[PDB]
């Protein structure tokens, strides 16, 4: 047990650096798309068209797990990439402060409000729709950035599955005292491994850097025209309301799948 | 009363022992606490020393506000039980030392008593419960010697303010 | 007819705004791809497959120009977008100082040295080849960003042809005095029109903002993995050695095609 | 001789005429010079005032060194012809005024005598040829008022002897 627990932790550290690698690209291409200009006519329709004409299937392991019907919740209607349609439950209120310290509650509350779009696809769709219709935007460039963003955010959250398996191997005993307890319902234990999986100090650690990146990398240089309104807040919103919760939700589903290892 | 929530297989990683005797010793079980001893009129704790300034490490800012805090600001971090899912963030507590002095300090961070022994925590163990981790201004205001690494204290959230 | 000359000046300034907004998206997309990680197996093959399966044709006006003699010089082999294969002549020497002031010669000399690649496709291909081969990089995300860059750089330089006619409309007296004089060659006119299209003071104006952007936007945030070696050099090299010269080359060709307008 | 390389239809755009007397008159033909008068032992020119610092509208750095220059630094910009294609960048020139004084200054920029009356210039006409555009330090060293704002001067690039 001793050596396998150490080696799993070594793999978790490597997997979390791959996870952190997706931050800057996601932020980069959001800003690249928003600086490019308005939305092209029928841009959403040509984006599903491009996805269908270039259907990138993922890791066999992941695809193996995506028709796991434990993992098929994170399977999307074609041609959209995985996990971009998964809906997290509304966990915050209408007026919750999102990015500023509140006495007695903290900062960066994770999850969705009533008025937040349901999934990353609706969210990225609402941002695109918030832009003005434009005659001069290049359709090929627009559609391709749009496509690139969809594959980036899907690749990001599904690294939660290898991360979960690495966490399980190292923290075997913690998880199986939950997974064996027959007192608790499956959803009642699902909630418990999720509290076991979440680490809000590191969430603040991550969202802090994401906020700094969304501000530094959206800086206006000499004679640049400004970004569309609220580009910075929507970048942070993507991480704080979708990327963080969907990832650990994938992590949780992967742990439940492995109650056969206790 | 309080018991551990789980256990943690230690991992030295690249912990650089010859300068840090506190590294996870690799194959030791470290207890995890989402809990902390009961909060009372004068709750006993271990005062430790820390800087909340930005430096050297990719450490990251404090949890209550997305901020760094200069060593002349009187700020503290509490272990997860006392931190209590940010229920005390921004609160000022009164800390009392055996030399007879006291000081007010703002709760601003968490002393994670669950996570550790991975790359993100310098391969160091979880913080204990029962710890109050304070900036150098708290130690100076209390008249304590910083080279004394840890001292026994009490803390409360009572007011003692009414004139 | 000088209301028309003033009217064209107004759209030249609008066309100039469109051209400058391509800077940030190009720099952002390069940094997104290079922050993602190494190159995927046969992703150079995958990019052409994606271009082939999603062939965006240009606007008709550009399509009509790409099949006349002067415009077909920027026609590329399928499935590459236009102008990414056009080779600029080697105009400066192998030891040229590219990016720091030199007494008696200046700063930011534009053009290709003997050792720089022939065309933007070769250039962006050697940068990709400069990276480690990796087993962890997401192929869909990698390929799509590479695609999105190729459409960005071609759309950028092709705006030279609207810019050219806008300049011609405003400055028709200057260009017609060359386009009618029969003494000279076709090439001798071409050199003359580029001499009148040259504006090195604002190329320095542009390249210096490009330099600042490629440095600020490649800043390393907390615990970030460094970018590959020389990505910041290669960003400015893209503008300084291809985007700027190919654009004025396109807009020179556009003016000669319109010699009957005098 | 030297003669204009072309002409430029004027445009006013959004230019504020109530604060800019010299904006392009809208439809007026402005001459263009890639040339300059011949350079001789003491070349005649019109001295002009300008600042090469940042900190306003959003103009760019100087053409020769991609940098901004303090008003306290003695720097000049030359008409496109004299500028040739950066052949005099970093060169020092001697400038002589009618009051009998002289000064050296460093060439760092071009006074564009071709482009103008578009948005990139503030809808202003091309520079003349025969212009030496100098920082406030050059004016102070010469002892000129800097409210006359153009003076007749001579300039050289010939060397001097020491002991």
From TrEMBL, chains B, D:
<protein>
    <submittedName>
        <fullName>Ripening-related protein 3</fullName>
    </submittedName>
</protein>
<keyword id="KW-0964">Secreted</keyword>
<feature type="disulfide bond">
    <location>
        <begin position="111"/>
        <end position="127"/>
    </location>
</feature>
<dbReference type="GO" id="GO:0005576">
    <property type="term" value="C:extracellular region"/>
</dbReference>
<feature type="disulfide bond">
    <location>
        <begin position="64"/>
        <end position="89"/>
    </location>
</feature>
<keyword id="KW-0732">Signal</keyword>
<feature type="disulfide bond">
    <location>
        <begin position="15"/>
        <end position="23"/>
    </location>
</feature>
<comment type="similarity">
    <text>Belongs to the kiwellin family.</text>
</comment>
<feature type="disulfide bond">
    <location>
        <begin position="2"/>
        <end position="35"/>
    </location>
</feature>
<feature type="disulfide bond">
    <location>
        <begin position="24"/>
        <end position="117"/>
    </location>
</feature>
């Amino acid at each position: 047990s001793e050596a396998a627990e150490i080696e799993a932790g070594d793999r978790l550290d490597a997997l979390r650096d791959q996870l952190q690698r997706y931050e800057t690209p996601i932020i980069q291409t959001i800003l690249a798309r928003s600086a490019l200009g308005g939305r092209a006519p029928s841009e959403q329709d040509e984006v599903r068209a491009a996805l269908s004409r270039n259907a990138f299937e993922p890791s066999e392991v992941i695809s193996e797990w995506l028709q796991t019907e434990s993992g098929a919740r994170f399977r999307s209607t074609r041609p959209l990439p995985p996990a971009v349609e998964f809906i997290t439950p509304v966990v915050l209120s209408r007026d919750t402060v999102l990015d500023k310290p509140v006495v007695g509650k903290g900062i960066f509350p994770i999850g969705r409000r009533p008025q937040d779009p349901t999934n990353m696809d609706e969210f990225l769709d609402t941002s695109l729709l918030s832009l003005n219709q434009s005659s001069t935007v290049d359709l090929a460039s627009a559609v391709s950035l749009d496509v690139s963003l969809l594959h980036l955010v899907s690749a990001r959250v599904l690294l939660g599955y290898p991360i979960a398996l690495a966490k399980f191997d190292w923290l075997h005993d913690n998880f199986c005292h939950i997974l064996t307890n027959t007192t608790l319902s499956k959803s009642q234990k699902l909630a418990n491994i999720i509290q076991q999986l979440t680490d809000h100090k590191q969430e603040v650690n991550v969202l802090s850097r994401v906020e700094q990146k969304s501000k530094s990398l959206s800086h206006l240089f000499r004679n640049d025209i400004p970004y569309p309104p609220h580009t910075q807040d929507r970048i942070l919103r993507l991480f704080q309301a979708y990327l963080i919760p969907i990832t650990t939700q994938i992590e949780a589903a992967a742990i439940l799948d492995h109650a056969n290892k206790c | 009363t309080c018991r551990a929530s789980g256990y943690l297989p230690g991992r030295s990683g690249n912990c650089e022992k010859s300068n840090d005797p506190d590294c996870c010793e690799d194959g030791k079980m470290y207890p995890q606490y989402r809990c902390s001893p009961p909060v009372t009129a004068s709750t006993r704790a271990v005062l430790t020393l820390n800087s909340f300034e930005k430096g050297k490490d990719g450490g990251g800012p404090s949890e209550c506000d997305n901020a760094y805090h200069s060593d002349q600001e009187k700020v503290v971090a509490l272990s997860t039980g006392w931190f209590s899912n940010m229920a005390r963030c921004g609160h000022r507590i009164k800390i009392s030392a055996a030399n007879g002095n006291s000081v007010y300090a703002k709760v601003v961070d968490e002393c994670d008593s669950v996570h550790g022994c991975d790359d993100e925590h310098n391969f160091e163990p979880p913080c204990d419960n029962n710890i109050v981790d304070a900036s150098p201004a708290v130690w100076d205001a209390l008249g304590l010697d910083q080279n004394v690494g840890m001292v026994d204290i009490t803390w409360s959230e009572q007011h003692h303010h009414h004139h």
